[PDB]
């Protein structure tokens, strides 16, 4: 992810088949001739897509030009949360399935995984960051407090951002309950709120290298969203 001053990011295509699949996902959803109401509605929850991009001197080097959803914030607090019960896709080998389940064996149980966070602390004018090992260390016993940390600025719990996040996620949940054409594996929600205004958050769906056509509800994704909403809801009683 390369941040560009113009308010966009350049996401480098992942190696094949993942990069190519994410490109085709964005191209499908943002097709200029698309009249699919499910897909038109989905656009509301994704970063705006500005097409494929590569450097002038390097046609080989492929990127997705996307809206930087953090650009309108002064001190953006950012959390990446993987959603679903399975983070492997329907066509993974036994070895790949095993590797993906071992990366976080509670995925089925919890339905989501914190990939990282960057939280602005008001008193020090500084950020505290957590890497992938933070969320992977969380269990049922510690997920509520694990998620809460994102919304604590060193002085208070930002319950305004927690409540706004629930409301934004609820619209995404509604979309998932009104579609049976796509299932999403190893995809995330990107949470952003203002660290420095009240109730102002972004929640956007990202990471689409394992989105597949389907005939059914994405049950794993629904479970994950529901559980995530429940955890956030409990944090409002802190
Ligand atoms: C300084 O930290 C960040 C700043 C911006 C982002 C960011 C911002 C984005 O808008 C974004 C996106 O649209 C798609 C995507 O796959 C990833 C994205 O990441 C992520 C960050 O960790």
UniProtKB/Swiss-Prot annotation:
A Gene Ontology biological process term: inositol phosphate metabolic process
Pathway: Phospholipid metabolism; phosphatidylinositol metabolism
Residues engaged in binding substrate: 18, 82, 96-103, 132, 210
Consequence the record notes for mutating residue 100 to R: Decreased activity with inositol 1,4,5-trisphosphate. Increased phosphorylation of inositol 1,3,4,5-tetrakisphosphate
Catalytic reaction equation(s): 1D-myo-inositol 1,4,5-trisphosphate + 2 ATP = 1D-myo-inositol 1,3,4,5,6-pentakisphosphate + 2 ADP + 2 H(+); 1D-myo-inositol 1,3,4,6-tetrakisphosphate + ATP = 1D-myo-inositol 1,3,4,5,6-pentakisphosphate + ADP + H(+); 1-octadecanoyl-2-(5Z,8Z,11Z,14Z)-eicosatetraenoyl-sn-glycero-3-phospho-1D-myo-inositol 4,5-bisphosphate + ATP = 1-octadecanoyl-2-(5Z,8Z,11Z,14Z-eicosatetraenoyl)-sn-glycero-3-phospho-(1D-myo-inositol 3,4,5-triphosphate) + ADP + H(+); a 1,2-diacyl-sn-glycero-3-phospho-(1D-myo-inositol-4,5-bisphosphate) + ATP = a 1,2-diacyl-sn-glycero-3-phospho-(1D-myo-inositol-3,4,5-trisphosphate) + ADP + H(+)
Effect of residue 80 to N: Loss of kinase activity and ability to execute necroptosis
Keywords, in A-Z order: Acetylation, ATP-binding, Kinase, Lipid metabolism, Magnesium, Metal-binding, Nucleotide-binding, Nucleus, Phospholipid metabolism, Phosphoprotein, Transferase
UniProt-annotated location(s): Nucleus
Activity regulation field: Inhibited by flavonoids that occupy the ATP-binding pocket. Inhibited by myricetin, quercetin, luteolin, kaempferol, isorhamnetin and diosmetin, and to a lesser degree by rhamnetin and apigenin.
Chief subcellular location: nucleus
Effect of residue 99 to R: Decreased activity with inositol 1,4,5-trisphosphate. No effect on phosphorylation of inositol 1,3,4,5-tetrakisphosphate
GO CC annotations on file: ciliary basal body; cytoplasm; nucleoplasm; nucleus
Residues engaged in binding ATP: 11, 67-69, 80, 207
Annotated phenotype, changing residue 18 to A: Strongly decreased enzyme activity
Protein function: Inositol phosphate kinase with a broad substrate specificity. Phosphorylates inositol 1,4,5-trisphosphate (Ins(1,4,5)P3) first to inositol 1,3,4,5-tetrakisphosphate and then to inositol 1,3,4,5,6-pentakisphosphate (Ins(1,3,4,5,6)P5). Phosphorylates inositol 1,3,4,6-tetrakisphosphate (Ins(1,3,4,6)P4). Phosphorylates inositol 1,4,5,6-tetrakisphosphate (Ins(1,4,5,6)P4). Phosphorylates glycero-3-phospho-1D-myo-inositol 4,5-bisphosphate to glycero-3-phospho-1D-myo-inositol 3,4,5-trisphosphate.
The protein, known as: Inositol polyphosphate multikinase
Native source organism of the sequence: Homo sapiens
Gene that specifies this protein: IPMK
Shown residues within the full chain: 65 to 416 of 416
């Amino acid at each position: 992810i390369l941040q560009h001053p113009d308010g966009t990011v350049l996401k480098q295509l992942q190696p094949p088949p993942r990069g190519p699949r994410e490109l085709e996902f964005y191209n499908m959803v943002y097709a200029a001739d698309c009249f699919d109401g499910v897909l038109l509605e989905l656009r509301k929850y994704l970063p705006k897509y500005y097409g494929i991009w590569s450097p002038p001197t390097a046609p080989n080097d492929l990127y997705l030009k996307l809206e930087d959803v953090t650009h309108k914030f002064n001190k953006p607090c950012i959390m990446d949360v993987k959603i679903g019960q399975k983070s492997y896709d329907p066509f993974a080998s036994s070895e790949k399935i095993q590797q993906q389940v071992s990366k976080y064996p509670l995925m089925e149980e919890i339905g989501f995984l914190v990939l990282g966070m960057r939280v602005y602390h008001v008193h020090s004018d500084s950020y505290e960051t957590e890497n992938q090992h933070y969320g992977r260390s969380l269990t049922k016993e510690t997920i509520k407090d694990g998620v809460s940390r994102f919304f604590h600025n060193g002085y208070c719990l930002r319950k305004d951002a927690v409540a706004a996040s629930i409301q934004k996620i609820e619209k995404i949940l509604q979309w998932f309950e009104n579609q049976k054409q796509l299932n999403f594996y190893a995809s995330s929600l990107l949470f952003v709120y203002e660290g420095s205004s009240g109730g102002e958050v972004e929640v956007r769906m990202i990471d689409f290298a394992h989105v597949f056509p389907s005939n059914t509800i994405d049950e794993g994704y629904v479970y994950g969203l529901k559980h995530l909403i429940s955890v956030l809801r409990s944090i409002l009683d802190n």
